[PDB]
Write a protein that binds this ligand. Structure first.
Ligand SMILES: *[C@@H]1O[C@H](CO)[C@@H](O[C@@H]2O[C@H](CO)[C@@H](O[C@@H]3O[C@H](CO)[C@@H](O)[C@H](O)[C@@H]3O)[C@H](O)[C@H]2NC(C)=O)[C@H](O)[C@H]1NC(C)=O
Ligand SMILES: *[C@@H]1O[C@H](CO)[C@@H](O[C@@H]2O[C@H](CO)[C@@H](O[C@@H]3O[C@H](CO)[C@@H](O)[C@H](O)[C@@H]3O)[C@H](O)[C@H]2NC(C)=O)[C@H](O)[C@H]1NC(C)=O
Ligand SMILES: *[C@@H]1O[C@H](CO)[C@@H](O[C@@H]2O[C@H](CO)[C@@H](O[C@@H]3O[C@H](CO)[C@@H](O)[C@H](O)[C@@H]3O)[C@H](O)[C@H]2NC(C)=O)[C@H](O)[C@H]1NC(C)=O
Ligand SMILES: *[C@@H]1O[C@H](CO)[C@@H](O[C@@H]2O[C@H](CO)[C@@H](O[C@@H]3O[C@H](CO)[C@@H](O)[C@H](O)[C@@H]3O)[C@H](O)[C@H]2NC(C)=O)[C@H](O)[C@H]1NC(C)=O
Ligand SMILES: *[C@@H]1O[C@H](CO)[C@@H](O[C@@H]2O[C@H](CO)[C@@H](O[C@@H]3O[C@H](CO)[C@@H](O)[C@H](O)[C@@H]3O)[C@H](O)[C@H]2NC(C)=O)[C@H](O)[C@H]1NC(C)=O
Ligand SMILES: *[C@@H]1O[C@H](CO)[C@@H](O[C@@H]2O[C@H](CO)[C@@H](O[C@@H]3O[C@H](CO)[C@@H](O)[C@H](O)[C@@H]3O)[C@H](O)[C@H]2NC(C)=O)[C@H](O)[C@H]1NC(C)=O
Ligand SMILES: *[C@@H]1O[C@H](CO)[C@@H](O[C@@H]2O[C@H](CO)[C@@H](O)[C@H](O)[C@H]2NC(C)=O)[C@H](O)[C@H]1NC(C)=O
Ligand SMILES: *[C@@H]1O[C@H](CO)[C@@H](O[C@@H]2O[C@H](CO)[C@@H](O)[C@H](O)[C@H]2NC(C)=O)[C@H](O)[C@H]1NC(C)=O
Ligand SMILES: *[C@@H]1O[C@H](CO)[C@@H](O[C@@H]2O[C@H](CO)[C@@H](O)[C@H](O)[C@H]2NC(C)=O)[C@H](O)[C@H]1NC(C)=O
Ligand SMILES: *[C@@H]1O[C@H](CO)[C@@H](O)[C@H](O)[C@H]1NC(C)=O
Ligand SMILES: *[C@@H]1O[C@H](CO)[C@@H](O)[C@H](O)[C@H]1NC(C)=O
Ligand SMILES: *[C@@H]1O[C@H](CO)[C@@H](O)[C@H](O)[C@H]1NC(C)=O
Ligand SMILES: *[C@@H]1O[C@H](CO)[C@@H](O)[C@H](O)[C@H]1NC(C)=O
Ligand SMILES: *[C@@H]1O[C@H](CO)[C@@H](O)[C@H](O)[C@H]1NC(C)=O
Ligand SMILES: *[C@@H]1O[C@H](CO)[C@@H](O)[C@H](O)[C@H]1NC(C)=O
Ligand SMILES: *[C@@H]1O[C@H](CO)[C@@H](O)[C@H](O)[C@H]1NC(C)=O
Ligand SMILES: *[C@@H]1O[C@H](CO)[C@@H](O)[C@H](O)[C@H]1NC(C)=O
Ligand SMILES: *[C@@H]1O[C@H](CO)[C@@H](O)[C@H](O)[C@H]1NC(C)=O
Ligand SMILES: *[C@@H]1O[C@H](CO)[C@@H](O)[C@H](O)[C@H]1NC(C)=O
Ligand SMILES: *[C@@H]1O[C@H](CO)[C@@H](O)[C@H](O)[C@H]1NC(C)=O
Ligand SMILES: *[C@@H]1O[C@H](CO)[C@@H](O)[C@H](O)[C@H]1NC(C)=O
Ligand SMILES: [Zn+2]
Ligand SMILES: [Zn+2]
Ligand SMILES: [Zn+2]
Ligand SMILES: [Zn+2]
Ligand SMILES: [Zn+2]
Lengths: 56, 197, 217, 217, 197, 217, 197, 56, 56
């Protein structure tokens, strides 16, 4: 509910420099964390767990 | 009546009413409504009166009854069921009985009915009581305006509705189309000595 | 929250106002809408209980009108009217409503001049600031609720733990030397050398030779 | 913001006070400076509006003094005077002013005892605490304004995104195993081993042998 | 009078006044000032008065005209242009002409001029009017260190300035030294029944 | 903090209340406990000031009662009494006290109905909400004390410095390419390639060949 | 009376008394207590009075003393040291002797002492006096219940304690068991005109 | 004293999801920091400095 | 304006332990980030971009 309400108010919030800065930092942080998890091997570990001894 | 003010916020308005409450407990508190500059109205219980301010004077001080005692002021009441509304209006306007100048009245036998008259002219021996009465009407009636002229003659008149002195204005005509103002009652029930009275 | 039945409105049905907006009337005495709500609540209470008994020889209605209504506000409005400047006659109230969340501001008088309602262009700044204040209050209520349940000490602990973890990661990347190496010599492990390069084992004499720092190898 | 004319001061010129300090008088009925400002405002309105026209037959000034100032404050000052303790006689007001930003506190009475002003030593704690409160208000105004424009949900999103990114960096440094290696054997890539170490292909029998975890090689 | 209070904050003071309000609008609100421990002055309209309290009384109760009515009190003034200020001060002190001891005066034609005196002595048959008058004077004038002693004579004297009895303490030569106080007006223009009158 | 002597209580010893709890009485005119405290403080002042001399010819106690007691609150209590609903008769006050910290709430009336103190089950929603408000007030007071001394600009500077350092760590892990490499050729160090891949030295002709980026090597 | 609310918060209560203020300032702070529906006490100075409401009053308008002047009110007191308590009770009850039908009382020498009576019966010619006195008692006595019924006879009894008519209800017994309320004395002293008077 | 007061109020603080999340994040961050200082040589450097030229 | 205003108020702010800690951690974070960017070769990339094919 909180996330939906926040998303419904984005145009009001996205009128100030700090809000745009925070949104950009959040998006960059999430994207880079996803990249790091992909590079570190969390996705590979999950794939191995889901298909352990069932494919080659 | 509602227009967009931002993105999701919207300008909205609400209108309240207290006239029903004025009628709900119509006893021990009248309902005051002003028709225009020279006409004012008062409804107490089931009896409605007309307040008129103008320069005319149909009633004279020579061969007509004058009111001194606060108890016998019911002479100008053809249906003498109760003059409590008139008495309470008179002593809420700021008028006094011990040392204040009296007011005129008319015999109930005459067909003219109640013709309670006050002298509020801006002249000699009349700038002490008239100003006080006009301040009282300012405090009771919201949009009160002075129709008199400085240095000239001007009077005040109170007539029960339905009488010839009230003419055809009363009945199911003016008082019906008049809207009781609750600010008049709010100013009318408060006794703090900090008001215009 | 607080609701007004149909007989208290003009050309409208029963409508309800939020508790938070009405809660602003708890300590407010310069608001006409709060006074009207107080009168309505007193009427509702009196009809519910006091009106039933026929002992209505006591004027608690008046004793409340001069008590729960701020006469200072009435006299200020009367003074404003006598100065021919806009005033409140306790009839129409305007506010700013957030359509999505449903929470609004405390209604404000629609001022009247010359016996006519002011158009929505003379107090434009008033409702612009009302909308801005509504947005600010909506954003600050969440902060107030967060501060009323989340300790400052816990936030401090989390922030300092994050700083400590970031510093730990930094020291992990850069690396910190673990033991000294003598200049021109091999690794002195497992012996440990002081600033003078000696040791208590006696293998390395205390010649005060310069030493360097090397990480794990 | 608010400015006092030349004739309103003694041995001084026109002085202007900030709106925020003056805005503290909206609900303050326990401050003498606010009452004096209200009297000045009423005088200014009366001269501009209630003085040009010859209709000055109503003594609105008395009703203004009845309502525009706090009578209980006057009576409290009178009681303090009658008890020979310091009181306010509505002539001199002191405050704490920040020179650089121009933000100043709401002026407070310079109390008088025995008909003489205090020597700035009998209320030293008063102005010390007032300066401290001014600094606190200056620091807290920025927090309030920021919370009025920046949502707390956005701050929470940023904080949790930073935590997620830092955790991702940590797992990047330490590394996470991607496949199992049989004990005493080489890497079974491209084949994958289950918890029992067997393969659906039949190459690796399901002997339930223990297995270890290794990262990418 | 500004000194450093901290690093960048500074201690500052502002002095306010109400001279223009109490002078350009002298009518309907007189300005009062405490010149001495026993000398007080009232300036209503365009005429200045002297108000003093002490034990020495020049007025006598044998061959002097008294005052019982709030209307004939204007006779007790040589230059009886307007005694409305005296009347309003008298009924603002809390004195009521109905059930309070009356006051005397000097003949207008007499050389010494008008001299209004009150009996506020702390003795028998005078501990009801005197206490109320002194309370009203405490309300009207900020400071009041009365000289009346129990069992001893003490009188409150009001003298319109210009009379020879008022001495040089009135006129342009003096009086100006006393500072008219707006707190006196604030305690003087409020009718809340919660004051000392 | 503020303390009440023996003669002010029933079947109890001297009791002391915190400054923060009694600080609410500064502007509150709707609390009966604040009115009782004001009356007690006025009596304490009068004993030390209006008792050494027999000049007590003035009804200062009555004037204070007319001044420091909210007549509106007393009239509201009388109306509630006459309307057969619970009211306050100024004798018993209940509050929520945090035992460990020792800081509590402002005491509230123990309403009496039918000349009997309501049991602690009809206003059950009052004291539970009051305890919740006490915890919220403690946490909010901690937050306000923090915000009154720590500037928000410094907090923003610290947050942005932490973000900058975390981004620097991320680029440290990933690594930024320094110089371009030709297709299937070694790096041209120490020469540098332009957007077209050529060299100003003439060694590399400007053939507009595609180039790729590589990190330190 | 203390119970746990939360894991750390504890419910607590404090009981406040104001008997020291009333006892020390006996002349300034009259104390009013209520025994039950029909009995009340007033304690001013060092003398205590009994306020009783009953349907029966053994008096008669023919040969009983009637009090008009606000000065001869001390006759209704066997030890006529001071009747200021009755004076304050009358002027705070909302009872003005100028334009309100007076009371009835018994002789000083007759062996029943002071028996001042207010005729508050809800019947003809008493629909204002009785209601006003009832409102005054409701103001001054918290928890005031009226046993007077419409269409019948009822009275209000005033009697300083110790008289034969006061019976054994006075003394150091019921007077002690009755608890003086400080809300009564707070209502007794505030003059704001917004009360039930 | 602040830490002691916070510890005395854990049962009432640990009633909201955000407080539990903050406590878990703090504990995980501290544990991971201790591991990193163990995995980066801070402990080894301190041990070497405390016993420099005094033992083997 | 905010930065310079905060700079003019440093001596009054540098009286509480938390403010000094925040200033110290901010300075350390900025210095370490500059070092990391220098070590990660971002400055080298900027230098290469500025003088691409113009100097050796
Ligand atoms: C209401 O009060 C006004 C106050 O002006 C009265 O009007 C005035 O009436 C008098 C006669 O009563 C007119 O004559 C004047 O009388 C005396 C001497 O007898 C003196 O003031 C003048 O020399 C003049 O002769 C007077 O002109 C008139 N004033 C105005 C301004 O019109 C009026 O009579 C009162 N009405 C009632 C019904 O009592
Ligand atoms: C406060 O002042 C305003 C402005 O004078 C008053 O507004 C007036 O409200 C009445 C109803 O109370 C309006 O009459 C209505 O008008 C239309 C038809 O014209 C229709 O809705 C109804 O049949 C009714 O007649 C009136 O037009 C309106 N006047 C203006 C100038 O807008 C308001 O009543 C005042 N509050 C009081 C007296 O309590
Ligand atoms: C409130 O009480 C204070 C303390 O009594 C009064 O302060 C007085 O203010 C006046 C000016 O309004 C001072 O007089 C001035 O003195 C010097 C020397 O002549 C000069 O600056 C001016 O020419 C002027 O005469 C007076 O000294 C000062 N008194 C004290 C004891 O400091 C203040 O006036 C009172 N406010 C009122 C009555 O509204
Ligand atoms: C102003 O009122 C005072 C009372 O407050 C009047 O003074 C009083 O004068 C009478 C007449 O002598 C004194 O009464 C009697 O005096 C004799 C002579 O000593 C003695 O037997 C008793 O004292 C007796 O009561 C009374 O004491 C005295 N009071 C005082 C000391 O002020 C005064 O006459 C009044 N003056 C005017 C102008 O009305
Ligand atoms: C406000 O109303 C309440 C409720 O009627 C009053 O509470 C009453 O307080 C008195 C003491 O002031 C209690 O009397 C005490 O009772 C016991 C048993 O005797 C004992 O603790 C003492 O010896 C004393 O007699 C009384 O029981 C209590 N009534 C109820 C129903 O709880 C309170 O006094 C009123 N406030 C004022 C100022 O009158
Ligand atoms: C106290 O006031 C009450 C009324 O509040 C008085 O009682 C009323 O007295 C009048 C006297 O004229 C009675 O009117 C007449 O009484 C008798 C018996 O009915 C008869 O002559 C007539 O039919 C007429 O009603 C009236 O009835 C009576 N009311 C009641 C309810 O008894 C009472 O006299 C006053 N007491 C004193 C001592 O003044
Ligand atoms: C603000 O606007 C909202 C949205 O229109 C109002 O919420 C409506 O309230 C009415 C009351 O009769 C309901 O019938 C509707 O279903 C509500 N709509 C919703 C929830 O989307 C709200 O009442 C307004 N606030 C006011 C008028 O004070
Ligand atoms: C607080 O102090 C500042 C210091 O700059 C005052 O600002 C100056 O005030 C003087 C008063 O004589 C003016 O002449 C200057 O022009 C002002 N400088 C500005 C506005 O940059 C400020 O007025 C003081 N605040 C008060 C007295 O309320
Ligand atoms: C809230 O509770 C605390 C803890 O009991 C109270 O602090 C004690 O109060 C008693 C009252 O008799 C004193 O004797 C003690 O000295 C206080 N301190 C300690 C450490 O026990 C506190 O007074 C209570 N707050 C109130 C009643 O307002
Ligand atoms: C007011 O209305 C009445 C209606 O009868 C009319 O006669 C009168 O002339 C009006 N007055 C003004 C001043 O317009
Ligand atoms: C009214 O007229 C009647 C009938 O002529 C007469 O008896 C009565 O006295 C008159 N009233 C007044 C007050 O003049
Ligand atoms: C105000 O109302 C009056 C009276 O109806 C009218 O004459 C006037 O034009 C209106 N407007 C102004 C600006 O006075
Ligand atoms: C009042 O404002 C409305 C807004 O729609 C406009 O249409 C109308 O003309 C305005 N009336 C005036 C300016 O008299
Ligand atoms: C108070 O002022 C008086 C004169 O009004 C003076 O005699 C006395 O000494 C002063 N007291 C103090 C303590 O300064
Ligand atoms: C008042 O303070 C000043 C500060 O300069 C000092 O010189 C003076 O002696 C003080 N006066 C008194 C009466 O303490
Ligand atoms: C009062 O002040 C005046 C001022 O002229 C002076 O003449 C007179 O002697 C003073 N009286 C006393 C006793 O202070
Ligand atoms: C003043 O004296 C004259 C006689 O000379 C007398 O007529 C007049 O009435 C006296 N003054 C007063 C006010 O009585
Ligand atoms: C009120 O109190 C009386 C006296 O104890 C009792 O008889 C009655 O039943 C009670 N009723 C209510 C409604 O509380
Ligand atoms: C409140 O209710 C409980 C229920 O167990 C009862 O024991 C207690 O006496 C009551 N308290 C009162 C009536 O004061
Ligand atoms: C009230 O208490 C008194 C105490 O003396 C007793 O005599 C009387 O019967 C009680 N009841 C009534 C209804 O007065
Ligand atoms: C009381 O009776 C006595 C005679 O015993 C008588 O002189 C006196 O006037 C009477 N008082 C009255 C009726 O007030
Ligand atoms: Zn090594
Ligand atoms: Zn070794
Ligand atoms: Zn492998
Ligand atoms: Zn396989
Ligand atoms: Zn090259």
């Amino acid at each position: 509910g909180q996330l939906i309400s926040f998303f419904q108010e984005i145009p009001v919030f996205l009128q100030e420099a700090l809000n745009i800065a925070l949104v950009a930092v959040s998006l960059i942080a999430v994207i880079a964390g996803i990249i790091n998890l992909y590079k570190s091997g969390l996705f590979q570990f999950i794939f191995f767990l889901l298909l352990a001894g069932r494919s080659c | 009546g509602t227009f967009k003010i931002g993105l999701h916020t919207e300008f909205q308005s609400v209108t309240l009413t207290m006239q029903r409450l004025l009628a709900n407990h119509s006893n021990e508190l009248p309902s005051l409504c002003m028709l225009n500059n020279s006409f004012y109205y008062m409804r107490g219980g089931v009896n409605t009166f007309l307040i008129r301010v103008s320069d005319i004077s149909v009633l004279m001080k020579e061969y007509d009854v004058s009111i001194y005692e606060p108890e016998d002021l019911g002479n100008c009441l053809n249906k003498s069921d109760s003059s409590w509304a008139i008495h309470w209006f008179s002593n809420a306007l700021g008028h006094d009985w011990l040392m204040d100048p009296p007011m005129l009245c008319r015999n109930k036998t005459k067909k003219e009915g109640s013709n309670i008259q006050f002298n509020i002219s801006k002249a000699d021996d009349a700038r002490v009581y008239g100003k006080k009465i006009r301040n009282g009407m300012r405090h009771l009636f919201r949009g009160f305006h002075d129709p008199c002229e400085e240095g000239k003659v001007c009077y005040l008149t109170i007539n029960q509705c339905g009488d010839p002195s009230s003419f055809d204005y009363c009945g199911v005509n003016h008082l019906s189309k008049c809207q009781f103002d609750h600010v008049n009652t709010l100013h009318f029930l408060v006794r703090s000595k900090t008001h215009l009275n | 929250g607080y609701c007004l039945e149909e007989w208290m409105l003009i050309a409208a049905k029963m409508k309800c106002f939020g508790n938070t907006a009405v809660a602003k009337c708890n300590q407010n005495h310069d608001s006409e809408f709060c006074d009207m709500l107080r009168l309505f609540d007193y009427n509702k209470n009196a009809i519910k209980t006091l009106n039933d008994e026929a002992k209505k020889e006591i004027n608690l209605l008046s004793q409340a009108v001069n008590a729960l209504i701020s006469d200072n506000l009435l006299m200020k409005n009367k003074i404003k009217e006598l100065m021919s400047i806009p005033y409140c006659n306790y009839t129409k109230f305007w506010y700013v409503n957030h359509t999505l969340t449903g929470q609004h501001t405390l209604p404000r008088c629609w001022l009247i001049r010359n016996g006519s309602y002011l158009n929505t262009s003379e107090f434009r700044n008033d409702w612009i600031l009302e909308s801005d204040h509504l947005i600010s209050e909506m954003l600050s209520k969440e902060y107030a609720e967060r501060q009323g349940k989340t300790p400052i000490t816990l936030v401090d602990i989390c922030f300092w733990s994050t700083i400590f973890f970031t510093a730990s990661l930094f020291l992990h990347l850069v690396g910190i030397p673990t033991h000294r190496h003598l200049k021109g010599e091999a690794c002195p492990l497992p012996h440990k050398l002081d600033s003078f390069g000696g040791c208590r084992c006696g293998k390395y004499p205390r010649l005060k030779k310069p030493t360097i720092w090397h990480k794990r190898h």
